């Protein structure tokens, strides 16, 4: 019925808006674990300044 | 003259019921192609949505 093609039109939608909320939180997780990459390649430079810094000393 | 009166009488007697029936074929007849009409636009709408299925 017309009352059904509108039924399925919402919930399929609202399905699909829900997943891509999914996704879209998932890019920003996924930019997340990237910042966290930086910062702990950045964590290991110092690190390794750090140690050079002692041997210097 | 009283037989065919008589005659006369019947005739009309049968005349009067055949219109009426035929009065009476007339609405049903409109009622049943309304019914059919509107029968095959649900089946039509029925099968839209099973066309739905399809897309999903």
Redesign the interface.
């Known amino acids: 019925?017309?009352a059904?093609?509108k039924k399925?039109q919402m919930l399929?939608l609202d399905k699909e808006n829900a997943l891509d909320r999914a996704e879209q939180a998932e890019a920003d997780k996924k930019a997340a674990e990237d910042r966290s990459k930086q910062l702990e390649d950045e964590l290991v430079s110092l690190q390794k300044k750090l140690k050079g810094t002692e041997d210097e000393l | 003259s009283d037989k065919l009166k008589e005659a006369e009488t019947r005739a009309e007697f049968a005349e009067r019921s055949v219109t009426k029936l035929e009065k009476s074929i007339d609405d049903l007849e409109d009622e049943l192609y309304a019914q059919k009409l509107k029968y095959k636009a649900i089946s039509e709408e029925l099968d839209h949505a099973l066309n739905d299925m399809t897309s999903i």
């Open positions: 019925m017309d059904i093609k399925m399929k």
